Design a protein around this ligand. Structure first.
Ligand SMILES: [Mg+2]
Ligand SMILES: [Mg+2]
Ligand SMILES: [Mg+2]
Ligand SMILES: [Mg+2]
Ligand SMILES: [Mg+2]
Ligand SMILES: [Mg+2]
Ligand SMILES: [Mg+2]
Ligand SMILES: [Mg+2]
Ligand SMILES: [Mg+2]
Ligand SMILES: [Mg+2]
Ligand SMILES: [Mg+2]
Ligand SMILES: [Mg+2]
Ligand SMILES: [Mg+2]
Ligand SMILES: [Mg+2]
Ligand SMILES: [Mg+2]
Ligand SMILES: [Mg+2]
Ligand SMILES: [Mg+2]
Ligand SMILES: [Mg+2]
Ligand SMILES: [Mg+2]
Ligand SMILES: [Mg+2]
Ligand SMILES: [Mg+2]
Ligand SMILES: [Mg+2]
Ligand SMILES: [Mg+2]
Ligand SMILES: [Mg+2]
Ligand SMILES: [Mg+2]
Ligand SMILES: [Mg+2]
Ligand SMILES: [Mg+2]
Ligand SMILES: [Mg+2]
Ligand SMILES: [Mg+2]
Ligand SMILES: [Mg+2]
Ligand SMILES: [Mg+2]
Ligand SMILES: [Mg+2]
Ligand SMILES: [Mg+2]
Ligand SMILES: [Mg+2]
Ligand SMILES: [Mg+2]
Ligand SMILES: [Mg+2]
Ligand SMILES: [Mg+2]
Ligand SMILES: [Mg+2]
Ligand SMILES: [Mg+2]
Ligand SMILES: [Mg+2]
Ligand SMILES: [Mg+2]
Ligand SMILES: [Mg+2]
Ligand SMILES: [Mg+2]
Ligand SMILES: [Mg+2]
Ligand SMILES: [Mg+2]
Ligand SMILES: [Mg+2]
Ligand SMILES: [Mg+2]
Ligand SMILES: [Mg+2]
Ligand SMILES: [Mg+2]
Ligand SMILES: [Mg+2]
Ligand SMILES: [Mg+2]
Ligand SMILES: [Mg+2]
Ligand SMILES: [Mg+2]
Ligand SMILES: [Mg+2]
Ligand SMILES: [Mg+2]
Ligand SMILES: [Mg+2]
Ligand SMILES: [Mg+2]
Ligand SMILES: [Mg+2]
Ligand SMILES: [Mg+2]
Ligand SMILES: [Mg+2]
Ligand SMILES: [Mg+2]
Ligand SMILES: [Mg+2]
Ligand SMILES: [Mg+2]
Ligand SMILES: [Mg+2]
Ligand SMILES: [Mg+2]
Ligand SMILES: [Mg+2]
Ligand SMILES: [Mg+2]
Ligand SMILES: [Mg+2]
Ligand SMILES: [Mg+2]
Ligand SMILES: [Mg+2]
Ligand SMILES: [Mg+2]
Ligand SMILES: [Mg+2]
Ligand SMILES: [Mg+2]
Ligand SMILES: [Mg+2]
Ligand SMILES: [Mg+2]
Ligand SMILES: [Mg+2]
Ligand SMILES: [Mg+2]
Ligand SMILES: [Mg+2]
Ligand SMILES: [Mg+2]
Ligand SMILES: [Mg+2]
Ligand SMILES: [Mg+2]
Ligand SMILES: [Mg+2]
Ligand SMILES: [Zn+2]
Lengths: 204, 5, 140, 174, 37
RNA sequence: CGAUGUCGGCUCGUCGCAUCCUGGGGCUGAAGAAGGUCCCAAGGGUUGGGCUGUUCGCCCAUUAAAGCGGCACGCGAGCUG
RNA sequence: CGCUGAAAGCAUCUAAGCGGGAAGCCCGCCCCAAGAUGAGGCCUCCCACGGCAGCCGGUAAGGACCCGGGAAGACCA
């Protein structure tokens, strides 16, 4: 189980065997191993990765001490890759080869307060035939005196997106190591410039 | 208002 | 003359080996100790029972076909959120909950009864970390 | 009208050793442990093992006849051993050893390769005869049963894996 | 497998057995297999 | 009865299982293919139209299938009328 | 559906024991989650301040306020 931190660059498409391949470009390299979680000390196995160097003028003393114990320049983002013990003290795009399948995790785009139609694909109401101020309303939310209430988990309007989403089993189309570029086939959660995480697929 | 007739 | 009411005493710590004991018949005795009704100065509105440590709770014993037929139940508040876990699956995944669940249902409901449950410390295996308190081995 | 009280002949030189809830049977072909109720009593005599029950209740009468056969099957296992033969029937059906493994060509799109567990030895004399040999009578019958299930006897044609001595019961299909 | 409330022997080769808390009839004739239920 | 709004539709479901489909079986008057029948199984699925206010039902074209029921014959301080 | 097997010399999937066996069950996958008051763990930072398990200030590491904003957003966050 290998993994790396990255940033969504943007989408484009390449040509490969006379086919347009939709790709999302990710800038993944390089990630210094900042701490390794071990069964002896932490009860589990994981590598705390760093990503993007940070202006040391903005790094308070608790964090500076944390980087110091690793001999690592101050970094913007710390994320652990679970069950991953890389050999070196740095993780780069090289851990992926074209043809492999990866899982990408990002933070979806935030719809804010979202209606029942956008959020849950509800049908809403009719737009004519007398429909009275309910065109985007959810309809009934219950029964009558039995059970006399509304279920937990009831699909209602509310906030939507800006949540952790993992899309799975994406093809690694290319690895351009001189630019720390990973090219993945298909779509990846969140906006351009968003932080993403690239793990080896759990699909088999 | 409709009726219970 | 008014009935005696006791000042606060430091409570006794106690240890019980559950191995090969019958589940409900051990719990009945743990509850009594936690309520402290074995003490002559028992007072119903104060936690003045004993602290009970149990080792080898994984080795509790049950009669009949209850390993496969006694169903613990959990409801989550959601449609369809009734979870059924048979006794052996619990013994195999969280064996200390078997005796904790048995003792809790025999304790008074309410704030004090909840406090008394916290004075119960149940461990699968032969060992417990409360050596600081040096609990007294009891037979039951 | 009884099995429990019938004594067990022990060939020279099989040893039967008694222990709490177990008897060990060592012989020229191997060892077998026979778990036995502590409510029973296994008695080692001259070339003979006997089992005794401590009452005439239904459980004790049932464990009694049971325990005796279990031990008798183990005494036989370590000396004579156990075997069961399977006959393959069908125009394209055959079987061959591939090392220690049993390979069945029994009319599927693929062959079936059965591998032998410990104590089980596959002997394929002819392409239509397979033998399952071992000391454990239960295990030998279980492996044999597995192999037969790979292609059970047809209800309408003499086609499939049969036990030796297994009748051929067919019904009309027209 | 016949599943019914009245299970009996159907032919002289039928056998009534109780396995796993249920009454069965077993027989060399597979039509006669019965479970009580 | 100093008021517990009554059909159908729409919307949103959720539950039961006496199961429509899909999964697993036994029996068959099971050759194969396809069926019948009973058993297990409620995880998921269970189409679009013509007629009528209709529920229901019939019909068209499909489908793995076009399930049956409870929830104040679920749901009018949610809509319709 | 079996293997082995009594009771019940036979037979029996069962009474002792062992196999096989569902889109279902548990885990596995994705998300939430220590108010899990049973409030968990790890890495790092500051440190015994001054005045009659309490009070009163001035501080530490840090934090908030305010400001420029933001594919974050009703306000808040
Ligand atoms: Mg993102
Ligand atoms: Mg992230
Ligand atoms: Mg976002
Ligand atoms: Mg979007
Ligand atoms: Mg927004
Ligand atoms: Mg809406
Ligand atoms: Mg929509
Ligand atoms: Mg949506
Ligand atoms: Mg609509
Ligand atoms: Mg619309
Ligand atoms: Mg409109
Ligand atoms: Mg109107
Ligand atoms: Mg309105
Ligand atoms: Mg309008
Ligand atoms: Mg509404
Ligand atoms: Mg009402
Ligand atoms: Mg109503
Ligand atoms: Mg209610
Ligand atoms: Mg949000
Ligand atoms: Mg999502
Ligand atoms: Mg693919
Ligand atoms: Mg290429
Ligand atoms: Mg670059
Ligand atoms: Mg007094
Ligand atoms: Mg006891
Ligand atoms: Mg008390
Ligand atoms: Mg007390
Ligand atoms: Mg039991
Ligand atoms: Mg009361
Ligand atoms: Mg009849
Ligand atoms: Mg028979
Ligand atoms: Mg009235
Ligand atoms: Mg009034
Ligand atoms: Mg009134
Ligand atoms: Mg009124
Ligand atoms: Mg319904
Ligand atoms: Mg049923
Ligand atoms: Mg079916
Ligand atoms: Mg079927
Ligand atoms: Mg057929
Ligand atoms: Mg035919
Ligand atoms: Mg059938
Ligand atoms: Mg049946
Ligand atoms: Mg279902
Ligand atoms: Mg229709
Ligand atoms: Mg028309
Ligand atoms: Mg119409
Ligand atoms: Mg109609
Ligand atoms: Mg009509
Ligand atoms: Mg049809
Ligand atoms: Mg079909
Ligand atoms: Mg109604
Ligand atoms: Mg209805
Ligand atoms: Mg209504
Ligand atoms: Mg209205
Ligand atoms: Mg209405
Ligand atoms: Mg209403
Ligand atoms: Mg109302
Ligand atoms: Mg309402
Ligand atoms: Mg109302
Ligand atoms: Mg009108
Ligand atoms: Mg009108
Ligand atoms: Mg026999
Ligand atoms: Mg038999
Ligand atoms: Mg048994
Ligand atoms: Mg089994
Ligand atoms: Mg089998
Ligand atoms: Mg999380
Ligand atoms: Mg906490
Ligand atoms: Mg947390
Ligand atoms: Mg508390
Ligand atoms: Mg505490
Ligand atoms: Mg709690
Ligand atoms: Mg605490
Ligand atoms: Mg904490
Ligand atoms: Mg922990
Ligand atoms: Mg803050
Ligand atoms: Mg703003
Ligand atoms: Mg804000
Ligand atoms: Mg404001
Ligand atoms: Mg604002
Ligand atoms: Mg503010
Ligand atoms: Zn018969």
């Amino acid at each position: 189980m290998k993994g790396i931190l990255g940033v969504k660059v943007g989408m484009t498409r390449i040509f490969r065997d006379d086919r347009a391949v939709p790709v999302t470009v990710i800038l993944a390299g390089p990630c210094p191993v900042v701490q390794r979680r071990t069964p002896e000390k932490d009860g589990y196995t994981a590598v705390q990765l760093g990503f993007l160097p940070q202006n040391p003028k903005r790094v308070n003393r608790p964090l500076k001490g944390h980087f110091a114990k690793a001999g690592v320049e101050p970094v913007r983002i710390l994320r652990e890759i679970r069950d991953f013990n890389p050999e070196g003290d740095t993780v780069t795009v090289e851990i992926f080869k074209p043809g492999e399948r990866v899982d990408v995790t990002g933070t979806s785009k935030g719809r804010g307060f979202a209606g029942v139609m956008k959020r849950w694909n509800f049908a809403g109401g009719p737009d004519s035939h007398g429909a009275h101020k309910i065109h985007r309303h959810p309809g009934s939310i219950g029964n009558r005196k039995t059970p006399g209430r509304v279920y937990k988990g009831k699909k209602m309007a509310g906030h939507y997106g800006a949540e952790r989403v993992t899309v799975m089993n994406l093809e690694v189309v290319d690895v351009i190591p001189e630019e720390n570029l990973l090219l993945v086939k298909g779509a990846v959660p969140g906006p351009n410039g968003g932080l993403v995480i690239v793990r080896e697929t759990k699909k088999a | 208002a409709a009726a219970k007739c | 003359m008014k009935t005696y009411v006791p000042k606060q005493v430091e409570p006794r710590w106690v240890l019980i080996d559950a191995e090969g004991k019958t589940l409900g018949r051990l719990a009945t005795k743990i509850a009594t100790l936690l309520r402290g009704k074995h003490r002559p100065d028992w007072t119903p509105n104060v936690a003045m029972g004993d602290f009970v440590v149990v080792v080898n709770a994984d080795k509790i014993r049950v009669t009949g076909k209850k390993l496969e037929q006694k169903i613990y139940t959990r409801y989550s508040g959601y449609p369809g959120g009734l979870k059924k876990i048979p006794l052996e699956k619990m013994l195999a995944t969280h064996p200390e909950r078997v005796l904790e669940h048995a003792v809790k249902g025999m304790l008074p409901k309410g704030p004090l009864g909840r406090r008394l449950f916290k004075r119960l410390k149940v461990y699968a295996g032969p060992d417990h970390p409360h050596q600081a308190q040096r609990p007294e081995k009891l037979e039951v | 009208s009884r099995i429990g009280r019938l004594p067990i002949p022990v060939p020279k030189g099989v040893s039967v050793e008694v222990a709490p809830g177990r008897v060990k049977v060592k012989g020229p072909k191997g060892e077998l442990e026979v778990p036995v109720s502590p409510e029973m009593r296994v008695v080692v005599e001259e070339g003979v093992v006997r089992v005794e029950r401590p009452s005439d209740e239904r459980r004790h009468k049932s464990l009694h006849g049971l325990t005796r056969t279990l031990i008798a099957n183990a005494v036989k296992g370590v000396s004579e051993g156990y075997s069961k033969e399977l006959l393959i029937k069908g125009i394209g059906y055959r079987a061959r050893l591939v090392g220690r493994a049993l390979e069945l060509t029994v009319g599927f799109s693929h062959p079936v390769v059965v591998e032998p567990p410990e104590g089980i030895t596959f002997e394929v004399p002819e392409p239509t005869r397979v033998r399952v040999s071992g000391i454990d009578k239960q295990k030998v019958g279980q492996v044999a049963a597995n192999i037969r299930a790979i292609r059970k006897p047809s209800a309408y044609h003499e086609k499939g894996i049969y036990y030796a001595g297994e009748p051929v019961r067919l019904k009309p299909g027209k | 497998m016949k599943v019914r409330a009245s299970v009996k022997r159907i032919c002289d080769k039928c056998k009534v057995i109780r396995r796993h808390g249920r009454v069965y009839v077993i027989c060399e004739n597979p039509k006669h297999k019965q479970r009580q239920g």
